[PDB]
Amino acid sequence: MAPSRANTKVIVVGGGGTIGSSTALHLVRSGYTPSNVTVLDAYPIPSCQSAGNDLNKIMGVSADPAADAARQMWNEDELFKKFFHNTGRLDCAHGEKDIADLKKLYQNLVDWGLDATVEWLDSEDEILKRMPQLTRDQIKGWKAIFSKDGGWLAAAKAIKAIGEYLRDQGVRFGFYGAGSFKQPLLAEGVCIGVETVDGTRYYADKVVLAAGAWSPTLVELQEQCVSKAWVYGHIQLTPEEAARYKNSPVVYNGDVGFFFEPNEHGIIKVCDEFPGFTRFKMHQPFGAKAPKRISVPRSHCKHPTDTIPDASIVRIRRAIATFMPQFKNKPLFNQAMCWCTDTADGHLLICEHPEWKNFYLATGDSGHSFKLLPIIGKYVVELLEGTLADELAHKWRWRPGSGDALKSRREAPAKDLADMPGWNHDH
Template identity: 70%
Template sequence: MPPSRASTKVIVIGGGGTLGSSTALHLLRAGYTPSNITVLDTYPIPSAQSAGNDLNKIMGIRIRNPVDKQLSLEARDMWRNDEVFKPYFHNTGRLDCAHTPESIASLRKSYEAILKAGSGLEKTHHWLSTEDEILARAPLLDRKQIKGWKAIYSEDGGWLAAAKAINSIGQVLKEKGVTFGFGSAGSFKKPLFDEDGTKAIGIETVDGTQYFADKVVLAAGAWSPTLVDLEGQCCSKAWVYAHMQLTPEEAAEYKECPVVYNSELGFFFEPNEKGVIKVCDEFPGFTRFKQHQPYGASTTKHISFPRSHAKHPTDTIPDESDASIRRAISAFLPRFKEKELFNRALCWCTDTADANLLICEHPKWKNFILATGDSGHSFKILPNIGKHVVELIEGTLAEDLAESWRWRPGSGDPLISRRAAPARDLADLPGWNHDEPSDDDMDVKDVAVSLASVKIGENIGEKVVEDGARVGVKVLA
């Protein structure tokens, strides 16, 4: 092990989320001293405002470009074999469906790309051209609802128990003695620099705590563009989900059901162990634009600002989202179309124009690393993405990855991004009920006093950070 790893101090901002927790884990695995790794987040792991703190996420192989293919295959192998992640991969298969002429043509093009991709994918992906073939893979779909549908069935696909997987990382970090800071003591305010103002030497949090380190990693997900000026490279957007409770008898019927996705409708998952099904609709996303000045900007900017459901649990979803989720249920699960929906909420991600990650050193701030721009497809690479962030920290990141994830302002419009249509702003949508505060959502001082009420876990331990503030680690039951 190079001596520098043992002595190098690293701060991971947003360490309770997907990219941040993975980075912290791979710092440990690379041999960094646990007490020299500081994980900061507004909420304990798994962070309640992270998109990764979710019941489940889709697993599949993404072959849009060679980088995506590499990451997907790396991740697939780790979900299958790595003990930290293996329990949380439900390899039920994935059914990608289409029913309009345009979407069928696009799906067929995707299948032909899979056949050319190599790596054995042609053996694990199957084109389904009839209702009978689709029903053979997902027998509980309604034949009347899938008339004219085509599909790709992926044996590599399934779903990931998202919050539990991040929590598994959190347990490792705690057991190894990583330093934590949560609440206002874990919420980023600004970087700290050396005398000439060009090299980051740490950060200051909302409560005034200063943490010093050799490297700073900002992995704050949808909040990243609000914290530092990303010069328009990322736009944060929300998507909608809802849950249904099935009886034990109903849930048993859907055991081992593949994830069913239709780009015109949405998707649903196999029930979890408590009989809960998550359903999502599919659309270009919602924004929430405000005037705001992130650190490094010379003036205020028009920025899409996430609104944490963890902090605002009474917020509702737009009326049209409720209707479109019901429409998806009517197509996928018509027998449950009258079921009550609960835990309806917005899930915030941040898109880049080309849907590639933004993982690079800030061009003006040496030792300040950005790890963001998930573009809604990054949870599947939770097991391995942190390895590549560590490579960037150490200057060994492969050239093709560095090129794909480079700093690239002006390269396109992230508002449109991956769904080829602009997102719409929540302010324009009926039904989105919320208590818009007079102060800014960045004010997280009240979060610190409410950490004990986070519903997803129980406090299993404490650690004293250098400034004496006590923080807890939440671990799922």
């Protein structure tokens, strides 16, 4: 500790988002001086364009130690526990293949120690016992895994609760032109701070880039991360319709989509499941020699007249017709795109930059990292301090050329928004 923890200054770029807010939290909890920690975001915490700024996210149960460590904190941490809604989760499958995959997943969870809280549902009867709001006609031939531990996360409220703690402790903040990263400040091969769009300079000993889907746009990542959009929309229930779904399990079918119990206002959110969309644009990230075609997020917060593609509407209507056939005439409203960045292998990118000393990447969220909100900052702090477990250091390493992130671990290469009509309502 060249400076000690107490004397180390750290800038967290994207500190209004999932990984960034977690990092700031763990710096303060670890004993960094709060006023030595600066959170920079394009938008105030919880950032309007953060993938974590939503009513709800699912808690994926999986045979993953990092996810397990996060799940413990969602159950027990004084800050996080109140934002976890343990309603259970139903993972459903149909066809003689998706069912084979689900059976292998089930066996994997049992092998890893989850036998007491995971159940195999081998028939329509068994599915309807766990989710009686479904309709037999729509689930013919389905099988499911029920995860008793499992549920949904009040995502924006969790990030806001972090923001309140950081403010109360004395963390420094910069937003808008004073928070929008433009470039690292480098000197003699070392990163010694950040410059924002408006020309404000911040000097620090270490800088973390936790800019989510914006990370490959801000600095040269050699296509390790490719940014893609997922879609959702909303339906409004009457008070009596809503009461039928109170504390109901999350339902997911990889072939269809997923949905959540209604919020306090009777609104259900419905998501597609698909390989995501790029939005290619010429852009020159810091460190690129010239402009290049990269997927650049089309931010709903900056372009609030945007919706989602016509093809996404078709798929979400199909999700509603399957899960919720009695609500098929309800309008789908507040349609929006949300952005994530995929790696080729779907693992995180948590590493020091190989040339810019003291600049650290904390991205590659790969569409499945909101569940890690409580724990991920601990790993980032351990990276800064040189104490991250070897296995995780290897898994999350700098790895350009390690495969094609446009397809990643998904079913197909993502299609581009330029080719998908229906979302753009600009002049």
